[PDB]
C-alpha cells in the first residue's frame, strides 16, 4: 500500500541539510502522505473518466486532475518529464 | 533516482472507481511523488528548525500540513 521506505527516505534526505536527521516515524508519515496524494489525484481522475464514459485513466487525465486540485506547479515539469519519456 | 511503477499502479488500483490505467500514468506519478516528497519535507524542516532540533519528526510534518493549503488533503492522514 506504500512506496518503499528506502526510496521515500532518499528523496527526503536530498531535501534537508547533509547533516540533518529524519526519524523513522517521520519517514512512515511521508509514505502515508504519498499514498494519499496518489489516491487523491487518482480519485479525481477516475470520477471525471467515468462521467465521460471512458474506461482508461491516461497521463493527460492525471495532469488535468492535478491542475483541477491546485497542484498547478506540477503540470509543466510533468509534461517535460513525460515528453522526455516517449522520445 | 526514479521510483517503482508497479507499486504506484497498485496504489492507483486500490480505488474501486478506477478501471484501466494508461501505461504513462504511473510514470507521471513517479515524478509527481518526488516533487511532493521534496516539498513536504522542506516544509516540515521549517518546524524542525523553529523547534531548535536537527531531527525531522512526525510532529513537524503534521504542523507543515496545517500551514499550506495545498496540503489540506492530508489533514486527516496526519492528525495535528
Amino acid at each position: 500500500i506504500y512506496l518503499p521506505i528506502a526510496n521515500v527516505a532518499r528523496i527526503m534526505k536530498n531535501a534537508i541539510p547533509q547533516t540533518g536527521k529524519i526519524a523513522k516515524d517521520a519517514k512512515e508519515c511521508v509514505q502515508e502522505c504519498v499514498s494519499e496524494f496518489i489516491s487523491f489525484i487518482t480519485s479525481e481522475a477516475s470520477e471525471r473518466c467515468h462521467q465521460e464514459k471512458r474506461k482508461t485513466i491516461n497521463g493527460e487525465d492525471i495532469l488535468f486532475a492535478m491542475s483541477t486540485l491546485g497542484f498547478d506547479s506540477y503540470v509543466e515539469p510533468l509534461k517535460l518529464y513525460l515528453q522526455k519519456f516517449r522520445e | 533516482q526514479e521510483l517503482p511503477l508497479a507499486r504506484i499502479k497498485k496504489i492507483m488500483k486500490l480505488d474501486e472507481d478506477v478501471k484501466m490505467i494508461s501505461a504513462e500514468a504511473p510514470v507521471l506519478f513517479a515524478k509527481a511523488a518526488q516533487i511532493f516528497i521534496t516539498e513536504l519535507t522542506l516544509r516540515a524542516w521549517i518546524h524542525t528548525e523553529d523547534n531548535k532540533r536537527r531531527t525531522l519528526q512526525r510532529n513537524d510534518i503534521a504542523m507543515a500540513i496545517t500551514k499550506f493549503d495545498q496540503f489540506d488533503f492530508l489533514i486527516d492522514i496526519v492528525p495535528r
Binding site: S39, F40 | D15, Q70, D72, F73, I75, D76
Partner: peptide
C-alpha cells in the same frame, strides 16, 4: 477551506469508511 480540493477531500473521507 481549499476550494479546489474540498469536494475531493470529503469524497476521500467518505470513501475511507
Amino acid at each position: 477551506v481549499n476550494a479546489k480540493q474540498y469536494x475531493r477531500i470529503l469524497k476521500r473521507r467518505x470513501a475511507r469508511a
